Amino acid sequence: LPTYKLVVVGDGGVGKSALTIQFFQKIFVPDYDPTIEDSYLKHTEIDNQWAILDVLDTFSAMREQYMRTGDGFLIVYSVTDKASFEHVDRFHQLILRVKDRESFPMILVANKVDLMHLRKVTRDQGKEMATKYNIPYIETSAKDPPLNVDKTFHDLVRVIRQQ
Ligand SMILES: Nc1nc2c(ncn2[C@@H]2O[C@H](COP(=O)(O)OP(=O)(O)NP(=O)(O)O)[C@@H](O)[C@H]2O)c(=O)[nH]1
Ligand SMILES: [Mg+2]
């Protein structure tokens, strides 16, 4: 029974926590930022193959353990936060250095696309960035009813399996 350690990274406020709690617990709780580090563990079936998903919602010995051991990374920015998108490169570079690899399983996640009037990063900008890194691109909303939240996590597992 394979365990996949997934790591969610990105700037403050982009929705790492909201995405994770939506995926594991199927709720959206506005302006909830966890008091303590919460680990996430669940059995789920992806393309008929069962897996344990072990997720870190990112000093911390825990963080750096997951950065080192992680099987795949979600790199999240918010479409309403241009800086968060500009900072994606820091996260991409950080991950490749820690894994000492030229590529590693990862998905670029453009979150908060429900806030349409506030969108500062276009679909095509996002897609062009993902292309530059040769990684998948997906748009999400953690807000109910959620968009692409299961697909995002399941797709990362698919990337890991198909490497
Ligand atoms: N409308 C909308 N709000 C969202 C979405 N995702 C997160 N939010 C909201 O944005 C705020 C910040 O989200 P949060 O999940 O805590 O972000 P974070 O990346 O975990 N922040 P941190 O790095 O500081 O832990 C919260 O108020 C949350 O409800 C989304 O898809 N749509
Ligand atoms: Mg958080």
Question: What does the CA dihedral 11, 98, 7, 117 come to, rounded to 10 degrees?
Answer: 30
In the chain, where the domains are located: 1-163
Tokens of 94: 């950080």
Smallest Cα–Cα separation from 153: which of 63, 57, 29? 57
- Obtained via which technique? X-ray
Q: Are 75 and 106 in contact (CB under 8 A)?
A: yes
- Given the CA of residue 31, which atom of ligand 1 is nearest to it? 27
- Give the helix ranges, DSSP H, for the chain: 16-25, 61-69, 82-86, 88-98, 123-133, 149-161
* Centroid of ligand 1 to alpha carbon of 75 (angstroms): 14
CATH 3.40.50.300 assigned to domain 1-163? The reply is yes
Closest residue (by CA) to atom 13 of ligand 1?
15
